[PDB]
UniProtKB/Swiss-Prot annotation:
Induction entry: By viral transfection.
Disease entry from the Swiss-Prot or TrEMBL record: Polyglucosan body myopathy 1 with or without immunodeficiency: A disease characterized by polyglucosan storage myopathy associated with early-onset progressive muscle weakness and progressive dilated cardiomyopathy, which may necessitate cardiac transplant in severe cases. Some patients present with severe immunodeficiency, invasive bacterial infections and chronic autoinflammation.
Ranges where the Ubiquitin-like domain occurs: 6-70
Protein name per Swiss-Prot or TrEMBL: RanBP-type and C3HC4-type zinc finger-containing protein 1
Disulfide bond positions: none
Protein family per UniProt: Belongs to the RBR family.
Known function: E3 ubiquitin-protein ligase, which accepts ubiquitin from specific E2 ubiquitin-conjugating enzymes, such as UBE2L3/UBCM4, and then transfers it to substrates. Functions as an E3 ligase for oxidized IREB2 and both heme and oxygen are necessary for IREB2 ubiquitination. Promotes ubiquitination of TAB2 and IRF3 and their degradation by the proteasome. Component of the LUBAC complex which conjugates linear ('Met-1'-linked) polyubiquitin chains to substrates and plays a key role in NF-kappa-B activation and regulation of inflammation.
Domain-related comment: The RanBP2-type zinc finger, also called Npl4 zinc finger (NZF), mediates binding to 'Met-1'-linked polyubiquitins. The UBL domain mediates association with RNF31 via interaction with its UBA domain.
Organism: Homo sapiens (Human)
Whole-protein residues included: 51 to 139 of 510
Lineage top rank: taxon: Eukaryota
Post-translational modification: Auto-ubiquitinated. Auto-ubiquitination leads to degradation by the proteasome. Phosphorylated. In vitro, phosphorylation inhibits auto-ubiquitination activity.
The protein's assembly and partners: Component of the LUBAC complex (linear ubiquitin chain assembly complex) which consists of SHARPIN, RBCK1 and RNF31. LUBAC has a MW of approximately 600 kDa suggesting a heteromultimeric assembly of its subunits. Interacts with beta-I-type (PRKCB1) and zeta-type protein kinase C (PRKCZ). Interacts with UBE2L3. Interacts with PRKCH. Associates with the TNF-R1 signaling complex (TNF-RSC) in a stimulation-dependent manner. Interacts with EYA1, TAB2, TAB3, MAP3K7 TRAF6 and RIPK1. Interacts with IRF3.
């Protein structure tokens, strides 16, 4: 579309006491639920494990990124991962 996507930085925090940072390309029209999934798709980050933190976060996973303050690139979010995990597709 004429309007490009935006790049969102996400801080990943694990129960296993390690922290990583990821950059996600999306649009504010997206939501955490959708976003959470791509992160799962992208990083195999179990959506169950994924604890997403945004200053403008709402318990509702469905609300848009824009509604969570992600209006453009340079926006940053925080993700926490549980001790649990997932299984490899292959």
């Amino acid at each position: 579309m004429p309007t490009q996507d935006i790049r969102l930085w996400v801080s990943v925090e694990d129960a296993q006491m390690h922290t990583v940072t990821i950059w996600l390309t999306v649009r504010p029209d997206m939501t955490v639920a959708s976003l959470k999934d791509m992160v799962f798709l992208d990083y195999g980050f179990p959506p169950v494990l994924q604890q997403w933190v945004i200053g403008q976060r709402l318990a509702r996973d469905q609300e848009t990124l824009h509604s969570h303050g992600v209006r453009q690139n340079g926006d940053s979010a925080y993700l926490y991962l549980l001790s649990a995990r997932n299984t490899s597709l292959n």
